[PDB]
């Protein structure tokens, strides 16, 4: 039973790089919670020559504080080693991505249907610490056919090695490379390919070559093959102010299916080629916590109040509204996450020293009791149907 469902529409444009990447940005990752977990399952919806076929993947319990990359714990309806064809990755700021290999079939099909498998949609099911079931439906604008094949190893001759490592963090590659050219601001063209473990990503300059290179930074967009990220891919050509050129490349998404010690080839013209080894940071890039607004509240006595307004895009006639609260750095998943309110609800059992109620305004007034002398921080989250989950960090401190 889904309490909130997010819808997305995805369209594959360029060539298939060997993986399909689906971003899921709207599930709650609660801040100041070493102990918060999330149960995640995924359903892949295939069409096989007109016949519907669902692949159910079980990713177990996410533990964002300690692990950023997840493989399926099990698969139902899939081929052998289907669990090896999918990755779930935490991207930071409450976002995650689902990645599937595109050139190996994850389901069983008959002789003759091997080229008739198309991906229709992906459903992601996400149950948070408060018991709320979240769902994401990613629809393909057009069903995308899987073309199974083995990708041969390819290496490019006549490419200068650099000692500079291209480091990928949360599917974003970042690297700055020194180039040299006879001409000097002289147009500039660059394309890249990232090759490894049967993955082949090609990135090119959208808007074409740089016809006149200005001094300083020359920002230019680049488009990589596969499903595009909502964060744009880009690069910068730094010119000295013969003449020095520095090339910053920030393409995304770059899947760790490439493996460590895959190779980034940079072909540029003013073809010259430099190659750099790619490494995938196993460490989390940044805090996975969803972004929050912080408010400092003072109080006298042991009672304090905070009013939670409607969230952005929350309509006055929203079928479902949910407000939740917990004290920062909770210790016990069994007793610290009972403070959840819906439009029909009371302060549940086990929610101690906190009261809340919706007004006719749909404003949610929360009151905290038994406040000691030290500052205490309350993490308040509000969601509404087809609205934006918003988390408030409210620090209650004794009036001076």
């Amino acid at each position: 039973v889904c309490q909130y469902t997010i819808q997305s529409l995805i369209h594959l444009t360029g060539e298939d790089p060997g993986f399909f990447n689906v971003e899921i940005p709207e599930f709650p990752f609660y801040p100041t919670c070493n102990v918060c977990t999330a149960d995640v399952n995924v359903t892949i919806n295939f069409d096989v020559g007109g016949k519907k076929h669902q692949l159910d993947l079980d990713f177990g319990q996410l533990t964002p504080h300690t692990k950023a990359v997840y493989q399926p714990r099990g698969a139902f309806g899939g081929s052998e080693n289907a669990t090896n064809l999918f990755l779930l990755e935490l991207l930071g700021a409450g976002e995650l991505a689902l990645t599937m290999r595109s050139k190996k079939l994850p389901i069983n099909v008959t002789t003759g249907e091997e080229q008739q498998v198309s991906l229709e949609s992906v459903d992601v099911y996400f149950q948070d610490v408060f018991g709320t079931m979240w769902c994401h439906h990613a629809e393909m604008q057009n069903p995308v056919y899987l073309i199974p094949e083995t990708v041969p190893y390819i290496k490019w001759d006549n490419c200068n090695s650099t000692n500079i490592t291209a480091v990928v963090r949360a599917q974003g590659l970042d690297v700055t490379l020194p180039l040299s050219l006879p001409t000097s601001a002289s147009n500039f063209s660059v394309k890249t390919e990232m090759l490894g473990n049967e993955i082949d990503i090609e990135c090119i300059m959208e808007d074409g070559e740089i016809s006149q290179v200005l001094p300083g930074d020359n920002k230019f967009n680049i488009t990589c093959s596969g499903y595009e990220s909502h964060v744009p891919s880009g690069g910068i050509l730094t010119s000295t102010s013969g003449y020095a050129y520095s090339l910053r490349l920030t393409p995304r998404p770059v899947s760790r299916f490439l493996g460590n010690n895959s190779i980034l080839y940079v072909f540029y013209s003013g073809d010259y080629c430099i190659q750099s080894n790619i490494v995938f940071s196993d460490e989390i890039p940044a805090s996975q916590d969803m972004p929050t607004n912080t408010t400092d509240i003072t109080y006298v006595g042991d009672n304090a109040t905070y009013s939670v307004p409607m969230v952005t895009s929350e309509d006055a006639n929203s079928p479902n509204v949910t407000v939740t609260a917990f004290w920062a750095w909770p210790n016990n998943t069994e007793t610290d996450f009972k403070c959840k309110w819906t439009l029909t609800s009371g302060t549940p059992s086990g929610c101690e020293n906190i009261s809340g109620a919706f007004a006719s305004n749909r404003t949610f007034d929360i009151t905290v009791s038994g406040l000691g002398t030290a500052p205490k921080t309350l993490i308040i989250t509000r969601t509404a149907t087809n609205a934006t989950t918003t988390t408030h960090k409210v620090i209650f401190s004794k009036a001076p």
């Binding site: 060539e15 298939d16 073309i147 041969p152 490019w156 001759d157 394309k191 074409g208 013209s269």
Partner: protein, 129 residues
Amino acid sequence: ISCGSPPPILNGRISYYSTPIAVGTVIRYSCSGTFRLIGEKSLLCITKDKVDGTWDKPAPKCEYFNKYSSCPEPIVPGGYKIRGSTPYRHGDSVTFACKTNFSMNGNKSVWCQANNMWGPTRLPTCVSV
């Protein structure tokens, strides 16, 4: 057996290969940044008489990038597209497949050329035989 050196490509490059070239070797073609690659990019060393090796298709070609080129949507009666989407600009490719009652003849993939035509081959056909 072994293949001789692969066919050259003007304004492009060929991936690394060791000599002599063994049957089963795959090489990749690419164009020089500004140019666009027209045709299948991977060549395979095969043997038909079990004596000499030969490459399984001709080399692709590189066209100078024409930012203005645009090809109409290609349509194959009896088949359907599995890769490609409008708009089609210079160097973009489409890949076809035939419906179940039909068999394909010709190359399954075509590229939008500078002269606003799909090439280098004709569109494939899907025919019930």
